[PDB]
Design a protein around this motif. Structure first.
Motif, PDB file in Angstrom:
ATOM      1  N   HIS A 134       1.509   4.657  -2.964  1.00  0.00           N
ATOM      2  CA  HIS A 134       1.548   6.116  -2.971  1.00  0.00           C
ATOM      3  C   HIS A 134       2.709   6.613  -3.828  1.00  0.00           C
ATOM      4  CE1 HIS A 134      -1.661   6.533  -0.121  1.00  0.00           C
ATOM      5  NE2 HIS A 134      -0.982   6.144   0.943  1.00  0.00           N
TER       6      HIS A 134
ATOM      7  N   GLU B 164      -6.144   6.840  -0.776  1.00  0.00           N
ATOM      8  CA  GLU B 164      -6.065   5.644   0.052  1.00  0.00           C
ATOM      9  C   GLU B 164      -6.729   4.451  -0.625  1.00  0.00           C
ATOM     10  OE1 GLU B 164      -4.627   5.080   3.616  1.00  0.00           O
ATOM     11  OE2 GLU B 164      -3.475   6.108   2.092  1.00  0.00           O
TER      12      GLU B 164
ATOM     13  N   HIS C 212       0.823  -1.212   0.000  1.00  0.00           N
ATOM     14  CA  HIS C 212       0.000   0.000   0.000  1.00  0.00           C
ATOM     15  C   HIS C 212       0.852   1.255   0.000  1.00  0.00           C
ATOM     16  CE1 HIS C 212      -3.211   2.733   1.626  1.00  0.00           C
ATOM     17  NE2 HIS C 212      -2.133   3.299   2.132  1.00  0.00           N
TER      18      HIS C 212
HETATM   19 ZN   LIG Z   1      -1.953   5.302   2.498  1.00  0.00          ZN
END
Ligand SMILES: [Zn+2]
Ligand SMILES: CC(C)C[C@H](NP(=O)(O)O[C@@H]1O[C@@H](C)[C@H](O)[C@@H](O)[C@H]1O)C(=O)N[C@@H](Cc1c[nH]c2ccccc12)C(=O)O
Ligand SMILES: CCCCCCCCOCCOCCOCCOCCO
Length: 371
Positions: free
Chosen positions: A240, A316, A236
């Motif tokens: 980004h 997110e 994860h």
């Molecule tokens: Zn994040």
């Protein structure tokens, strides 16, 4: 001058009432939702003039405006530091102690607070003297050079923080050799991430709370999750980077900084803005920044905060989806549940409060998306 003052104060009260309303709706959920829902069985079991007075008893008269401004900056930040202290102590040593999270002593807490205050001043005051000088010495386009200087300062600070500032406040150590270190390296290669070193920050010196950061990888030692879960969370995090979210945030912040310096340039000649706040005989540059950036720009600041919160939620979900892509949805699903448990997150929220405030979408929305 009265319309300006009144509108800033009424906007303040309006925001405060809106946020008190929202907070009440969320607090109601905590008092109301007293057993696990079925969607969740598997998931949880004056100061200016005072500064002049210090200046003139040291032999500096009013012509030394930047000097007086730096005194004001010191006292204003001290005042705010002091009035925040009772609250921070209560949160750390009552709330956090009571629920099992605090790990620090009072002596650590005060050592830490003084060091953060000193280091802040060491950077803040020199940078402030120069920025104020630049403003004074370059119009009618001073705002371009003001903007460029803050960009460069921001760049320097971010570039030196890891090596030269962060280790003053926390202990960093290399991740030990083992199975997790090697799978991180594999994953980083797999996405062309030029991983250099993996460090563990001893967050447990402060708190048992856990949180992963966004070159180097730094992992809290309290992050806990088994290895395959740490990896999905890293998946994860690395999303980004691959998706360019960090670059988008940097561009947004500098475009915003450019826009505010431009509008500051438009507005700073308006002597009524100063009179609104009790500056009749003088128009100090720093007071100008304070009034325009914090008071006058108030509605824009609120709208933008809210816009950045929505964007953040979108990023997110995209980072979660990138970990799904890497093949790690099942482990990320598991990871988010275990971190929610270690940190005692409550996974039901009011929809309005969470829309306004949550930078991360509620846990259940994240789990559904990973399915
Ligand atoms: Zn994040
Ligand atoms: C997969 C997860 C373990 C790591 C993942 N970190 P990430 O979203 O990439 O990044 C985090 O959130 C961003 C909004 C911030 O800008 C970052 O500074 C960072 O705090 C995250 O969802 N963090 C959430 C969830 C979370 C981690 N630790 C927590 C402790 C309490 C409550 C929630 C959390 C958060 O920041 O909160
Ligand atoms: C005359 C317009 C007032 C309408 C909005 C009421 C604002 C109340 O918020 C106050 C909350 O903050 C506590 C400190 O302020 C107390 C004074 O508020 C009185 C408002 O007239």
């Amino acid at each position: 001058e009265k319309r300006i003052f009144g509108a800033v104060l009424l906007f303040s009260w309006t925001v405060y009432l809106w946020e008190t309303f929202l907070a009440q709706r969320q607090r109601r959920i905590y008092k109301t939702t007293t057993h696990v829902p079925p969607e969740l069985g598997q998931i949880m079991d004056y100061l200016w003039r005072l500064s002049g007075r210090f200046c003139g008893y040291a032999g500096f008269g009013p012509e030394y405006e930047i000097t007086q401004s730096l005194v004001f900056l010191l006292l204003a930040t001290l005042f705010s530091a002091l009035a925040g202290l009772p609250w921070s102590l209560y949160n750390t040593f009552v709330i956090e102690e009571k629920h099992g999270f605090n790990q620090q002593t009072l002596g650590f807490f005060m050592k830490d607070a003084i060091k953060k205050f000193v280091v802040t001043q060491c950077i803040l005051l020199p940078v402030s003297s120069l920025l104020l000088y630049i403003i004074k010495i370059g119009g009618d386009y001073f705002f371009i050079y003001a903007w460029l200087f803050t960009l460069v300062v921001s760049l320097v600070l971010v570039t030196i923080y890891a090596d030269y500032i962060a280790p003053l406040f926390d202990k960093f150590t290399p991740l030990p050799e083992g199975k997790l270190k090697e799978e991180i390296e594999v994953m980083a290669k797999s996405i062309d991430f030029p991983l250099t070193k993996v460090y563990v920050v001893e967050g447990s010196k402060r708190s048992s709370h856990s949180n992963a950061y966004f070159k180097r990888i730094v992992l809290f030692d309290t992050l806990g999750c088994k290895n395959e879960e740490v990896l999905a969370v890293l998946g994860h995090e690395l999303g980004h980077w691959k998706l360019g979210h960090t670059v988008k945030n940097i561009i947004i912040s500098q475009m915003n900084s450019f826009l505010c310096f431009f509008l500051f340039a438009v507005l700073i000649g308006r002597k009524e803005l100063f009179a609104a706040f009790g500056f009749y005989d003088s128009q100090p540059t720093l007071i100008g920044l304070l009034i325009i950036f914090q008071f006058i720009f108030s509605p824009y600041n609120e709208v933008l905060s809210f816009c950045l919160t929505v964007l953040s939620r979108r990023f997110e979900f995209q980072a979660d989806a990138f970990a799904k892509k890497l093949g790690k949805a099942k482990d990320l699903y598991s990871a988010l549940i275990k971190l929610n448990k270690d940190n005692l997150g409550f996974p039901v929220s009011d929809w309005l409060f969470s829309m306004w405030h949550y930078s991360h979408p509620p846990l259940l929305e994240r789990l559904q998306a990973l399915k």
